[PDB]
Write a protein that binds this ligand. Structure first.
Ligand code: CLA
Ligand code: CLA
Ligand code: CLA
Ligand code: CLA
Ligand code: CLA
Ligand SMILES: CC1=C(/C=C/C(C)=C/C=C/C(C)=C/C=C/C=C(C)/C=C/C=C(C)/C=C/C2=C(C)CCCC2(C)C)C(C)(C)CCC1
Ligand SMILES: CCCCCCCCCCCCO[C@@H]1O[C@H](CO)[C@@H](O[C@H]2O[C@H](CO)[C@@H](O)[C@H](O)[C@H]2O)[C@H](O)[C@H]1O
Ligand SMILES: CCCCCCCS[C@@H]1O[C@H](CO)[C@@H](O)[C@H](O)[C@H]1O
Lengths: 57, 121
């Protein structure tokens, strides 16, 4: 069968499923962006942009 | 001349009475007569809270806040003595009334500041 490092080659001749996989990747990236922003908001201290700005945190 | 049923639920009960733009006259004070304040009303429109800086040597500012306990903030039905002093000055001595309100305001970022808004004594 396909070796583990080639499992995704089944997409090469399946435009529909390739688009699905790309949609899923895009979903994951957008989801990461959302999650990351939420976590940063849950941990960010806005009270001192002078000596405690975002890049210190 | 409003009744309770005109007023109930409108938010008007937490507002102090007002005077027209025409009321710019003068109320004469007779030194011989005794005076009282029959009704004192105080309606807060803004609650400011002094920020607490980190370096402690920076000028602290009073910042705006958001009222979160609704139209429950006004002091009213306060009465007291109005003394005429030797120098012609007047001194109000509060004797009674609804002269406090617990108030919670919220700072930017969510910190809540409860206070006993008051003019007791
Ligand atoms: C963008 C991500 C992505 C997408 C769109 C695809 C898409 C596809 N995969 Mg691939 N795959 C991926 C990542 C992805 N894969 C990763 C990271 C691995 C290594 C685990 C694999 C290993 C793999 C194998 C062995 C096979 C596929 C196969 C396929 C095809 C069929 C679906 C399937 O069985 O996947 C199954 C994939 C998973 C269930 C991924 C596991 C999820 C990981 C482990 C994270 C766990 C998720 C959880 C929410 C996060 C935990 C957080 C942690 C703190 C606990 C489809 C084209 C199949 C195929 O068609 O072969 C011919 C197939 O046999 N994939
Ligand atoms: C645009 C990015 C991109 C895309 C769409 C592909 C797509 C492909 N690669 Mg290629 N490749 C890429 C970049 C990419 N590659 C990069 C940057 C490298 C150097 C690291 C390679 C080196 C490489 C080799 C050596 C091979 C491929 C192969 C393949 C084919 C099969 C892949 C598969 O089934 O993996 C299956 C993978 C798994 C089941 C698990 C992999 C788990 C990885 C190692 C760790 C976890 C990764 C993590 C989840 C990703 C985080 C996101 C990332 C941005 C950091 C598929 C066409 C294979 C091929 O040509 O087959 C004919 C193959 O042999 N690629
Ligand atoms: C007709 C004009 C047209 C338009 C506007 C696009 C636009 C796009 N195509 Mg392309 N494509 C076209 C013609 C078109 N294509 C043709 C004729 C072919 C040959 C069949 C392709 C083959 C092709 C492939 C194989 C792939 C794309 C992909 C993409 C997307 C990559 C960017 C992305 O995902 O952003 C992120 C998305 C957003 C920010 C939101 C988009 C909002 C959507 C479009 C609203 C939905 C409207 C409609 C009902 C959905 C389908 C519309 C369709 C025109 C795309 C983008 C939406 C890639 C993709 O879909 O990856 C996920 C991809 O893998 N296209
Ligand atoms: C420019 C931006 C960019 C590009 C070009 C890619 C490209 C890719 N990503 Mg995506 N990704 C991105 C941004 C990007 N990513 C972002 C911002 C996020 C949010 C964190 C993701 C989240 C994400 C997930 C969850 C997955 C992908 C996967 C993929 C691969 C799908 C094709 C494949 O089968 O490769 C085959 C695999 C390779 C060619 C190996 C890539 C190895 C990378 C470059 C380094 C891995 C480091 C090390 C070995 C393991 C990490 C440490 C470990 C302890 C976690 C492709 C390489 C999928 C994948 O890897 O499938 C197996 C997958 O599951 N990405
Ligand atoms: C729907 C539209 C949309 C909008 C308005 C936003 C807006 C935003 N995104 Mg989100 N995002 C979206 C869709 C969107 N996103 C999608 C579909 C994904 C999944 C892929 C993401 C994944 C994502 C991640 C992982 C992150 C964001 C982040 C952000 C913020 C920073 C933007 C930035 O710096 O990008 C910069 C964009 C570029 C530098 C674009 C480079 C374009 C290259 C150079 C083009 C190369 C190819 C081209 C064909 C070359 C020829 C061009 C031609 C004219 C010559 C901003 C609020 C960031 C954030 O703050 O998260 C909370 C962040 O980390 N987004
Ligand atoms: C369904 C639905 C929905 C929902 C959705 C959601 C909720 C989503 C979520 C999403 C999410 C929440 C996502 C997330 C994602 C994430 C990710 C994707 C991540 C990844 C990661 C990575 C990849 C990493 C790696 C690493 C490590 C681990 C270590 C170091 C190095 C590195 C960085 C490499 C709604 C309601 C809207 C509507 C429609 C329907
Ligand atoms: C569709 C999915 C939506 C999911 C929603 C998830 C959103 C998560 C991020 C939003 C920001 C949350 O921000 C949240 O704020 C308050 C105050 O800073 C913090 O709360 C912390 O501080 C406050 C005030 O000092 C304390 O009363 C509380 O006990 C303490 O845990 C949380 O630790 C933080 O996480
Ligand atoms: C998808 C986002 C839904 C979650 C929004 C959470 C409310 S927003 C949240 O409010 C807190 C208290 O006022 C602040 O400390 C914090 O900085 C702010 O991000």
């Amino acid at each position: 069968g396909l070796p583990w490092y080639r499992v995704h080659t089944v997409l090469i001749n399946d435009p529909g499923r390739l688009i699905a996989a790309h949609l899923m990747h895009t979903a994951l990236v957008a989801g990461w962006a959302g999650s990351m922003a939420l976590y940063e908001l849950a941990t960010f201290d806005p009270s001192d942009p002078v000596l405690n700005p975002m890049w210190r945190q | 001349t409003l009744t309770y049923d005109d007023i109930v639920g409108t938010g008007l009960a937490n507002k102090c009475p007002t005077l027209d733009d025409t009321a710019r006259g003068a109320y004469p004070i007779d030194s011989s007569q005794t005076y009282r304040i029959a009704r004192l009303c105080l309606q807060p429109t803004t609650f400011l809270v002094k920020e607490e800086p980190k370096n402690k040597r920076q000028e602290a500012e009073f910042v705006p806040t958001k009222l979160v306990t609704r139209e429950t903030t006004s002091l009213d039905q306060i009465q007291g003595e109005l003394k005429v002093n030797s120098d012609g000055s007047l001194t109000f001595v509060e004797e009674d009334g609804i002269d406090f309100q617990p108030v919670t305001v919220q700072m930017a970022g969510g910190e809540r500041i409860p206070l006993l808004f008051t003019v007791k004594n």
